[PDB]
């Protein structure tokens, strides 16, 4: 679909077959997503923004749709305040800026 | 144009009549632009992220053109890590997601 920025581009996401809100964010390079048990291995990782970092559980090879479009990436895992879909899952579904 | 995102979506802006990158995100509320020194009167404002929270000086109704498309609207400025171009100023240049 085509998705105006006069709001936040919030969209409803299904993951380890739950589904949630999430940001399609263009400056994200990665996904981060709200404390949530997901099952299988994981990495420490640390992640930054505006006002510093904080620590995330990386998970790999995690399978999301995003409005019905499948995705296979890297999804972060922590105390994000919101769902933040980024450019290693955009890509995947075809998203693209356009101006 | 259209704008994927197997790179970050950087981009060069001229604000104040100085160029500068600047990285095209629907995830931002606001546009937040590194320290610069911009003509004009300033209020203090504070903004989170994804790490906490910055405190910016808020320039309302600053000239500001991103590839050649001109906006007019409001700026912060502060120690943001990176140069922000956000919603506020992505709709007055047109900008949508598709996929
Ligand atoms: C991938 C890890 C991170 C998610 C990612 N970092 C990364 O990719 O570094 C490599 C990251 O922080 N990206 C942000 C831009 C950015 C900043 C610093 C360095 C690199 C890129 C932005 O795209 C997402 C962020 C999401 C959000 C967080 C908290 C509350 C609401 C929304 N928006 C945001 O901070 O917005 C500010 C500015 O406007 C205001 O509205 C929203 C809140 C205010």
Do not use: S
């Amino acid at each position: 679909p085509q998705i105006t920025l006069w709001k936040r581009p919030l969209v409803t996401i299904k993951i380890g077959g739950q589904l949630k809100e999430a940001l399609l964010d263009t400056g994200a390079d990665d996904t981060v997503l709200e404390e949530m048990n997901l099952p299988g291995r994981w990495k420490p990782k640390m992640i930054g923004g505006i006002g510093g970092f904080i620590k995330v559980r990386q998970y790999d090879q995690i399978l999301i749709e995003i409005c019905g479009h499948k995705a296979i990436g890297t999804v972060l895992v922590g105390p994000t305040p919101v769902n933040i879909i980024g450019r290693n899952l955009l890509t995947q579904i075809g998203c693209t800026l356009n101006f």
